[PDB]
């Protein structure tokens, strides 16, 4: 499990060489954002249950077959697992967002999820549609002021959406 700071060091040991000054002002800029990144993860972890429940409700108002009798979302049990599978991906997307690198997301969330969903008969495309609906609500909730200083956050919400798309293409 790496953060974005450990990435450049793990590529520096490999060549066996010191970080040159261009990598250093690439990193001091990363530090110099800093507060924006944690404002982003603060906004996602403050509203996590709302994100998950609204995305699941939109998913079943859209695809009623999962809650149809015989569906993969039928009954209390299957539904309880589906409710917080999405909350697992939201948790690991927030971990990867605070780390600056999608290393924890690939290690312990997306590693082997595809044949896990294949071995159960779970339709991975509907999981991907649920991931996309969580993504849309998270980027919508990320760029509001809500009592923060005005500025641009665009390079951070692009990375936040990229983590969601990385999770969405790896499941299916």
């Amino acid at each position: 499990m790496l953060d974005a700071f450990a990435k450049v060091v793990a590529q520096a040991d490999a060549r066996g060489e010191f970080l040159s000054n261009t990598q250093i002002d690439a990193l001091s800029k990363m530090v110099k954002e800093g507060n924006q990144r944690l404002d982003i993860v603060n906004k996602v972890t403050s509203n996590a249950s709302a994100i998950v429940t609204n995305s699941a409700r939109a998913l079943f108002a859209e695809q009623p077959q999962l809650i149809q009798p015989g569906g993969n979302a039928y009954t209390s049990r299957r539904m309880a697992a589906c409710l917080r599978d999405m909350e697992i991906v939201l948790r690991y997307v927030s971990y990867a967002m605070i780390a600056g690198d999608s290393s924890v997301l690939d290690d312990r969330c997306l590693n082997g999820l595809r044949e896990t969903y294949q071995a159960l008969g779970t339709p991975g495309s509907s999981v991907a549609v649920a991931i996309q609906k969580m993504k849309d609500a998270s980027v919508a909730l990320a760029n509001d002021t809500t009592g923060t200083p005005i500025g641009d956050c665009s390079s951070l919400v692009a990375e936040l959406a990229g983590y969601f798309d990385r999770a969405a293409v790896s499941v299916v």
């Binding site: 499990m1 790496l2 450990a6 990435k7 793990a10 590529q11 490999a14 060549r15 066996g16 690198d101 290393s103 690939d106 290690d107 997306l110 590693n111 082997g112 293409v169 790896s170």
Partner: peptide, 26 residues
């Protein structure tokens, strides 16, 4: 997509291995 099974992403040992002693990963 994802790294091979078991390999912790970002700290492979074959990173800067020479070609004269590189081993193909099964």
């Amino acid at each position: 997509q994802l790294a091979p099974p078991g390999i912790p992403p970002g700290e492979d040992a074959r990173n800067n291995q020479s070609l004269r002693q590189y081993v193909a990963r099964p």
